[PDB]
Amino acid sequence: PVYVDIDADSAFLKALQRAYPMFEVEPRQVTPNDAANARAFSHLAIKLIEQEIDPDSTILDIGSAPARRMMSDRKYHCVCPMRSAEDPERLANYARKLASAAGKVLDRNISGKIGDLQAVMAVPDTETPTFCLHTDVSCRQRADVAIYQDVYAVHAPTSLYHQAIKGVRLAYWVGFDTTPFMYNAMAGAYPSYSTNWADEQVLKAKNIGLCSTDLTEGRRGKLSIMRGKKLEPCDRVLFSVGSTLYPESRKLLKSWHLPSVFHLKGKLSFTCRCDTVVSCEGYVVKRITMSPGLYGKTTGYAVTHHADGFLMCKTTDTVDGERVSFSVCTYVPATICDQMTGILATEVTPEDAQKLLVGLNQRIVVNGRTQRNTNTMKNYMIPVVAQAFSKWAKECRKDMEDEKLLGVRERTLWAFKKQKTHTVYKRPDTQSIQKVQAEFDSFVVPSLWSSGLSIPLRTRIKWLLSK
Amino acid sequence: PVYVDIDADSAFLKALQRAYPMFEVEPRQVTPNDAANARAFSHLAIKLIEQEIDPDSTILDIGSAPARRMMSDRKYHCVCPMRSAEDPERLANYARKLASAAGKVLDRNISGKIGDLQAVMAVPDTETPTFCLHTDVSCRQRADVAIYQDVYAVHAPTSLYHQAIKGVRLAYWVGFDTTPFMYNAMAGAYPSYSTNWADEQVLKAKNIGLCSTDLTEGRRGKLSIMRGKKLEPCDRVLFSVGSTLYPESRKLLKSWHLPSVFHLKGKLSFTCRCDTVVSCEGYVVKRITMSPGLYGKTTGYAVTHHADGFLMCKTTDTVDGERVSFSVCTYVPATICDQMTGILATEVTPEDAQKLLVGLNQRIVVNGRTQRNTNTMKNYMIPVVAQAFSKWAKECRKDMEDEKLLGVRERTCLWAFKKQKTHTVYKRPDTQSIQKVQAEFDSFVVPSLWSSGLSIPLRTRIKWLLSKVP
Amino acid sequence: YPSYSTNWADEQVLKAKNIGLCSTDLTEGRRGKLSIMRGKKLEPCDRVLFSVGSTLYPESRKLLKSWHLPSVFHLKGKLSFTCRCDTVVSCEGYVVKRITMSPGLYGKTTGYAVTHHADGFLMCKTTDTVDGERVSFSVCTYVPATICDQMTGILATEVTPEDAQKLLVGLNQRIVVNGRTQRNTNTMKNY
Amino acid sequence: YIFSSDTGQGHLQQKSVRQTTLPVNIVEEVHEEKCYPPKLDEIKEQLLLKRLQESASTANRSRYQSRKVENMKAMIIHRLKEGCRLYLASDTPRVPSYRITYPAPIYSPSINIKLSNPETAVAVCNEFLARNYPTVASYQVTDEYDAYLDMVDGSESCLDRATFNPSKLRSYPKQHSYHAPTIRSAVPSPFQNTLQNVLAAATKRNCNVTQMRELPTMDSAAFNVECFKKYACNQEYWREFASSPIRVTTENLTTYVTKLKGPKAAALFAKTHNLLPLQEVPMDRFTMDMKRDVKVTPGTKHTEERPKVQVIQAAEPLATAYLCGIHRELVRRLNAVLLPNVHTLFDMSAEDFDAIIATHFKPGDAVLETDIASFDKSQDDSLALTAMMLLEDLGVDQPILDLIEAAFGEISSCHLPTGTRFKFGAMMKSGMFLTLFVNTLLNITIASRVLEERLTTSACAAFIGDDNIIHGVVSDALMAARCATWMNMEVKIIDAVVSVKAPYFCGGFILHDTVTGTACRVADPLKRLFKLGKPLAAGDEQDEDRRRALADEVTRWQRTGLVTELERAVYSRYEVQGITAVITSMATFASSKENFKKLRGPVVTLYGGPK
Ligand SMILES: Nc1nc2c(ncn2[C@@H]2O[C@H](COP(=O)(O)OP(=O)(O)OP(=O)(O)O)[C@@H](O)[C@H]2O)c(=O)[nH]1
Ligand SMILES: Nc1nc2c(ncn2[C@@H]2O[C@H](COP(=O)(O)OP(=O)(O)OP(=O)(O)O)[C@@H](O)[C@H]2O)c(=O)[nH]1
Ligand SMILES: Nc1ncnc2c1ncn2[C@@H]1O[C@H](COP(=O)(O)OP(=O)(O)OP(=O)(O)O)[C@@H](O)[C@H]1O
Ligand SMILES: Nc1ncnc2c1ncn2[C@@H]1O[C@H](COP(=O)(O)OP(=O)(O)OP(=O)(O)O)[C@@H](O)[C@H]1O
Ligand SMILES: [Zn+2]
Ligand SMILES: [Zn+2]
């Protein structure tokens, strides 16, 4: 059995059990964390990965926290460079736990870890079978398995190649779904995990998940001479998981949407594949297998499978007092989507759609008995979803009144009119396809390694380990 | 008893039990795969074949992965060219499993499989009674049974002839039904197995099962110099089973729609037959027999039996901002088709038909025992299906309001006739379809030049894995 | 032959639209269709195709009609015989016939064949579209006895085709509970 | 229904026949009411129709309908008389009967108290609901999408001996327009006519088999009639009644048809062309009707479970017209054989009931009220034999009994829109023209057998339908042991005490006045209060008969000497406080036409309009 930090009467328990049919999940709450759902999935994903790999295999770990792998009976090599504000705190915590447990546990051979950690502190350049201060493209340790957990700060084709030339034949990735960023959207949400993300230019909106505004009476205008007749997404995205803020980049996010088959070329040639094994309401787990040589041919296509509805529509808001328009995206539960099939056969106003959605969500009746406040989906996303269905129904009817002939395209004045699209809706059990690049040959090696430690910091760990 | 990897609450268990009445099926779920239904059918198909084959007989396996034939107590001869992008992964997995259990059981000729695998690694051009690195044409092993499992990349008349001249008298084929591709359609679906396919020219559609588009506002026109003004099916076709992508070609797909009897004429002559033994909502199993000599005569017809409804209608959609029209095909459950008989006696609008279908898609329970399921058909195909029924009813009323005379076909000096519109084709359950194909073949061309496809680093890795025999 | 999933059709109507054994394709309608010949007559030919289940059997009309023997016939040659034909088993299309042959020459021949009906036989005129051109021919089928008995009162007056279809559907599909025995049966095929 | 319906039509009459101008009870004689024979005249209609065209302000039209309806009544009599030639008879000398009269009742003065602003009345009513019923006042958060929610979930049923077509089971909602209510009581809308609702209504399983007409069944019936005739009837009329039968007579048909109204006569006339004879009309074939209104009681039970669907089994239209002339004679004979202290609500009015119980109920008196609704009359076949034995003793002619008996055996029902067939065994509740009479007879018999001689020595007993009240009777173990022969939940009994726990009878309260010192009966205010929270269908113009009914009911509530008693009676029954303010709120609503418009709102349309 596996214990998770989840309330015993939550609706997420059923979803977790369905996604992991090989375990036995039980709830045990010890802290009122604001991101409990996001941590339960990560805990189960790691356990599944360890179960399928055989023992006595060296495992790399890119950008990890050493304190998490202390009590594991596996070989780990933590690559921990010092390039984040949360790194010095993690190192101090690792040393404190290591010294406190010295002696009480004997089957986890932490005595070797303590002394070996002392060696790297004295000289911050030597290699070590458990710790290092290098990067992914600078470490020179040889292994066969690499693990990525919530990493969005590296370039996937470049990082993977440097691991393959060291005898690595397997890789894993855990993180958010990349599909919303391939549609070039402006804002979105992950309702099941209390996650909201927005672009840099819409941080002063009024009716989105992540925004803040003020009160105004209405003036003539600003002293603006620049025209600025463009509002397009840029390469700057802000994430918010619960109460924690994370800045990200668009180019590095889209680089992880790898195709099915692609080739790596250079000094040595490799061929590899990418597959998806676990998917639950936004979190996915990807497995990559690499082989030496060059076989087959590529096509450059990526396929995504939707187990629940995916929506993207155009909305009008007021940013800093001025009306603008942009696009948003969200997820919809499968049960709600199936129950709306009949009503979208007609033309419905947004008011009628909104009232119907509320009744289905809060006052559902089963077996002749009413269940109050089931709350299948969060209420703050209903207004935007209701408008999306209204536009979708209108567009379908216009297509039925413009019947054309079979296998022809009219040309008289030889230009063809393009129609307007305001809503993209993907039903459950429907696949989406995108075009990407599947041929990579160019790589760059920094070869500019330099330590990032400090004298006062090094003294702190030395004092802790010299008890 | 036979165990399958599906959950106990699925509605697909009843269909599997009906198509396999000689087995006892129980569910046991250990993996949340997205293609559970497709994998379950293939597992049961292999078990049935093994019960019809006389033992102590060697079997060829074209394009096989030798990892799943390791525990079988038969004589398999895998033919594994190094042509696809998944082959290196399969070969490494096969070697790892062989060495990891070389002494635990040692009851399925494990030592022999290791010994001849090493021999092939030394000399590429070598024939062993268990493994080889040739193609279906260049192989030299002699057998009498051939098995094809999900093969769509070979020409059937050419491949079958090369097996026949080597003593093969029986063959099997497992795969998807090829009926939709004989109608020259643009897109289709297999809802029961979560499979969607589409032509490469319509990948930017809006309301089909495999597409993707963007949001636009509407601009006057595009300065596209290349003007075709034609929209016809092409060779390239894309498949999507679960979350996996497979490219296919129409010419090879259509070559497996064989007639009842056909003749193969070359340096030696053979007579062949083809029958269907298992059919379940899209998957079929075919048995082919060969015999030397020429007997009887041929007609050149193929017959398909429909246990459920089959539709092929015309729809209008916008591809990359431009409005066009093409054809879409699908399957319908038999129960839905039966209960629509009374409604389609008159003219009905698409709006009304959609409402009726939704109401018929609800459960009926009497005295605690169910009579109708809660979801007979998936909801993402209802809009297109309801449209097809509307046009079909309209075309039937016009036919019965214009009567001709018996035995006279009117063609009105110059005499000419008129063709009428046909926007939908509906094949009701318990109805057969007949097509015209070719039955005589005399040409068998081959490259006649084989080249190795194994690299040195791969050879060293395989040998290293087998080096540690304990 | 609805009870045995058997459909047969002539070789000239294989491209029909609404029969058991046919197949067609989508079109849009054309006015300038011209042909080399001007055939204006449509009679059945000698070639017929059978389909039992999923198996095809070519057949000939003359050979099929040669087994509809009379009750008494004479075989005259070097040796003369008198023969008889009887039907002993019949079930919705299949029959078992017994023939007794004796040497000599006795009696007198008449030249009539008798068939007894137990279910019901129909043959009417239908209008279909063959290869995009609209023509008319004749079809035949078998009907169960229970359905025929319950339609006696309705056909006293004149009925429209749409009214008759709705009555037939209601009589066909039924569910009976009657305590602890549910049936959910269908009397005849819906196509 | 019984006293008065929502539109003030009721089942009782409005003519007093039990009133006297003396301070003592006086026995009198029962007389007969002469009826005017209709006559036919066609020349008058022709000239009046032409004179209708030239000038018709308001009364000229009325003369046409009166002439037209009068012609129809004469035609019905002529056609109906010819059908029953084998059963028609003449008038025999009648048996005289006598009845007791009572002095007139005395009432206390009434003072009207009302508010001014109609919006404040709504606020007071809403505040009353929230304070006492928290869950009921928070149910409504959106529109009325009950039909859609019923379609999303499947159909669950418990049938027996039924057939239906599965291809016609589809329940997509149709257009629905109504007015938004102002009172926050969640009274549901009437159900839609679908196959799903029909199967849900017929989810009753009464499959029980016993001895049909064998010796054990007859023995139980023989004892039941013995108890009825020994403990509830006198012996001065049985031998005379047996000698004189009751048969179909021209006077019975002439009197019956003349009492029908306009639209009812026209409907009957339309079914007289192909007139079947009396012996040809089947008596065991019924049709199914759904059009009803849901019944709701005070409390919180309709916000958690869906209410049931009501159905009507209608008999042959000609069956209820040939034999419906014998109901009056049966009522007269039954009243003649009952004891003076046993009463039946048939052939009375509201005023007559008050005068009877004027000086019988006093504070500190025990009253026993019992209902027999929760009883399966289909399990035992002796319940039907007992009714027939009582009918035979009353003097019903023999061939007529066979026709009546045919409707109390195996019957079948059919639903015309869907062609659904149902079969039922022995059934007591139906839509025939002897339903209240047989139920009243069985109710008296059950009480007489259980109570034995305690029914004879009593002050006042009233029986009607499935309800009864008996004065001066308490609950003991003897009646429990007697009634526990088969099971225990045959009947439900409740003990009541005057001025402490007010007795309940026919949806009303029995209270003892303080100023005058007499008993009286008033209506239930909470039942009315929940009823104003019912949505009104669009296109309905019946918002004037309800105001008059409310005005009459409000006046009876504000009588002096009954305000304090009404407060205690409601609290002891429903455990609710603060009903004087609600009554005051009702007073201002029923004061003017415009004041009644504050209970409605804007029109809402659902499932309609392709826009
Ligand atoms: N966009 C983004 N999300 C992250 C990143 N790192 C972690 N997350 C996610 O944020 C969620 C919040 O969980 P955390 O409390 O941060 O996990 P933790 O490492 O145990 O605790 P911390 O020290 O706060 O990071 C995690 O489950 C991650 O899935 C990141 O770098 N970028
Ligand atoms: N169109 C097409 N379908 C295939 C092909 N190979 C397999 N399939 C189908 O895809 C389904 C899933 O394949 P798997 O059983 O998972 O094969 P695997 O050995 O486990 O590894 P993968 O092929 O990478 O999934 C199979 O059941 C087949 O029905 C192919 O070559 N072409
Ligand atoms: N080669 C690498 N490059 C950058 N970061 C790495 C690398 N290897 C490991 N990491 C770890 O990635 C983590 C993320 O650090 P990052 O450079 O992205 O700064 P950040 O802005 O605080 O995080 P983020 O951009 O994800 O919001 C660091 O803790 C770092 O130790
Ligand atoms: N004569 C043959 N020609 C091609 N493939 C063969 C042949 N014989 C066996 N095979 C097997 O078929 C597989 C090759 O399939 P293919 O080259 O079409 O891969 P692909 O490019 O992904 O396209 P597809 O979707 O059809 O599989 C290999 O596994 C191979 O072992
Ligand atoms: Zn390192
Ligand atoms: Zn070989």
PDB file of N, CA and C in Angstrom, chain B residues 339 355-356 358-360 362-368 372, chain D residues 151-152 154-159 166-167 169-170 172 205:
ATOM      1  N   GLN B 339     -33.929   0.112 -34.320  1.00  0.00           N
ATOM      2  CA  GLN B 339     -34.961   0.931 -33.698  1.00  0.00           C
ATOM      3  C   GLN B 339     -35.263   2.210 -34.469  1.00  0.00           C
ATOM      4  N   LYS B 355     -31.949  14.756 -32.071  1.00  0.00           N
ATOM      5  CA  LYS B 355     -32.661  14.643 -30.802  1.00  0.00           C
ATOM      6  C   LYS B 355     -33.138  13.217 -30.561  1.00  0.00           C
ATOM      7  N   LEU B 356     -33.628  12.551 -31.609  1.00  0.00           N
ATOM      8  CA  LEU B 356     -34.110  11.181 -31.462  1.00  0.00           C
ATOM      9  C   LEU B 356     -32.979  10.230 -31.089  1.00  0.00           C
ATOM     10  N   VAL B 358     -30.198  10.840 -29.429  1.00  0.00           N
ATOM     11  CA  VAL B 358     -29.765  11.030 -28.047  1.00  0.00           C
ATOM     12  C   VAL B 358     -30.712  10.321 -27.087  1.00  0.00           C
ATOM     13  N   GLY B 359     -32.020  10.434 -27.327  1.00  0.00           N
ATOM     14  CA  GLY B 359     -32.981   9.761 -26.469  1.00  0.00           C
ATOM     15  C   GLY B 359     -32.847   8.251 -26.511  1.00  0.00           C
ATOM     16  N   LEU B 360     -32.537   7.702 -27.686  1.00  0.00           N
ATOM     17  CA  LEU B 360     -32.350   6.263 -27.829  1.00  0.00           C
ATOM     18  C   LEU B 360     -31.037   5.777 -27.232  1.00  0.00           C
ATOM     19  N   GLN B 362     -29.991   5.890 -24.116  1.00  0.00           N
ATOM     20  CA  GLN B 362     -30.139   5.837 -22.671  1.00  0.00           C
ATOM     21  C   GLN B 362     -30.516   4.427 -22.235  1.00  0.00           C
ATOM     22  N   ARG B 363     -30.207   4.117 -20.979  1.00  0.00           N
ATOM     23  CA  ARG B 363     -30.402   2.769 -20.465  1.00  0.00           C
ATOM     24  C   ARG B 363     -31.878   2.481 -20.210  1.00  0.00           C
ATOM     25  N   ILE B 364     -32.221   1.195 -20.241  1.00  0.00           N
ATOM     26  CA  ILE B 364     -33.544   0.708 -19.866  1.00  0.00           C
ATOM     27  C   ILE B 364     -33.352  -0.477 -18.931  1.00  0.00           C
ATOM     28  N   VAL B 365     -33.866  -0.363 -17.708  1.00  0.00           N
ATOM     29  CA  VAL B 365     -33.761  -1.415 -16.705  1.00  0.00           C
ATOM     30  C   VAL B 365     -35.163  -1.774 -16.236  1.00  0.00           C
ATOM     31  N   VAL B 366     -35.493  -3.062 -16.284  1.00  0.00           N
ATOM     32  CA  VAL B 366     -36.801  -3.563 -15.875  1.00  0.00           C
ATOM     33  C   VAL B 366     -36.591  -4.638 -14.819  1.00  0.00           C
ATOM     34  N   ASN B 367     -37.203  -4.443 -13.648  1.00  0.00           N
ATOM     35  CA  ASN B 367     -37.173  -5.420 -12.557  1.00  0.00           C
ATOM     36  C   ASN B 367     -35.744  -5.754 -12.133  1.00  0.00           C
ATOM     37  N   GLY B 368     -34.858  -4.764 -12.212  1.00  0.00           N
ATOM     38  CA  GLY B 368     -33.490  -4.928 -11.768  1.00  0.00           C
ATOM     39  C   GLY B 368     -32.547  -5.555 -12.770  1.00  0.00           C
ATOM     40  N   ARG B 372     -31.156  -2.323 -22.075  1.00  0.00           N
ATOM     41  CA  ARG B 372     -30.461  -1.440 -22.999  1.00  0.00           C
ATOM     42  C   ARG B 372     -29.355  -0.721 -22.242  1.00  0.00           C
TER      43      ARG B 372
ATOM     44  N   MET D 151     -34.359  13.031 -18.378  1.00  0.00           N
ATOM     45  CA  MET D 151     -33.937  12.361 -19.602  1.00  0.00           C
ATOM     46  C   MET D 151     -32.497  11.867 -19.522  1.00  0.00           C
ATOM     47  N   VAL D 152     -31.623  12.600 -18.825  1.00  0.00           N
ATOM     48  CA  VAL D 152     -30.211  12.225 -18.766  1.00  0.00           C
ATOM     49  C   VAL D 152     -30.045  10.871 -18.088  1.00  0.00           C
ATOM     50  N   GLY D 154     -31.473   7.151 -16.821  1.00  0.00           N
ATOM     51  CA  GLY D 154     -32.287   6.169 -17.509  1.00  0.00           C
ATOM     52  C   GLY D 154     -33.662   5.958 -16.911  1.00  0.00           C
ATOM     53  N   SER D 155     -34.289   4.835 -17.251  1.00  0.00           N
ATOM     54  CA  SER D 155     -35.628   4.503 -16.785  1.00  0.00           C
ATOM     55  C   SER D 155     -35.560   3.277 -15.887  1.00  0.00           C
ATOM     56  N   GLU D 156     -36.112   3.399 -14.684  1.00  0.00           N
ATOM     57  CA  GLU D 156     -36.187   2.304 -13.727  1.00  0.00           C
ATOM     58  C   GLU D 156     -37.652   2.014 -13.437  1.00  0.00           C
ATOM     59  N   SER D 157     -38.034   0.741 -13.514  1.00  0.00           N
ATOM     60  CA  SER D 157     -39.430   0.368 -13.346  1.00  0.00           C
ATOM     61  C   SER D 157     -39.521  -1.021 -12.733  1.00  0.00           C
ATOM     62  N   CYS D 158     -40.690  -1.310 -12.160  1.00  0.00           N
ATOM     63  CA  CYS D 158     -41.009  -2.610 -11.568  1.00  0.00           C
ATOM     64  C   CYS D 158     -42.394  -2.998 -12.079  1.00  0.00           C
ATOM     65  N   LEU D 159     -42.432  -3.701 -13.206  1.00  0.00           N
ATOM     66  CA  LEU D 159     -43.677  -4.028 -13.883  1.00  0.00           C
ATOM     67  C   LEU D 159     -44.082  -5.475 -13.620  1.00  0.00           C
ATOM     68  N   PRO D 166     -40.077  -1.105 -27.267  1.00  0.00           N
ATOM     69  CA  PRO D 166     -38.860  -0.378 -26.872  1.00  0.00           C
ATOM     70  C   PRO D 166     -38.445   0.713 -27.845  1.00  0.00           C
ATOM     71  N   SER D 167     -38.909   0.674 -29.093  1.00  0.00           N
ATOM     72  CA  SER D 167     -38.507   1.662 -30.085  1.00  0.00           C
ATOM     73  C   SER D 167     -39.164   3.020 -29.878  1.00  0.00           C
ATOM     74  N   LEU D 169     -39.551   4.432 -26.725  1.00  0.00           N
ATOM     75  CA  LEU D 169     -39.157   4.956 -25.418  1.00  0.00           C
ATOM     76  C   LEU D 169     -38.084   6.027 -25.619  1.00  0.00           C
ATOM     77  N   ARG D 170     -38.565   7.255 -25.778  1.00  0.00           N
ATOM     78  CA  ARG D 170     -37.730   8.429 -25.994  1.00  0.00           C
ATOM     79  C   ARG D 170     -38.411   9.634 -25.359  1.00  0.00           C
ATOM     80  N   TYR D 172     -37.231  13.230 -25.084  1.00  0.00           N
ATOM     81  CA  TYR D 172     -36.688  14.569 -25.254  1.00  0.00           C
ATOM     82  C   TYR D 172     -37.761  15.606 -24.921  1.00  0.00           C
ATOM     83  N   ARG D 205     -46.601  -3.438  -7.313  1.00  0.00           N
ATOM     84  CA  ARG D 205     -46.608  -4.897  -7.405  1.00  0.00           C
ATOM     85  C   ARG D 205     -47.522  -5.446  -6.313  1.00  0.00           C
TER      86      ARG D 205
END
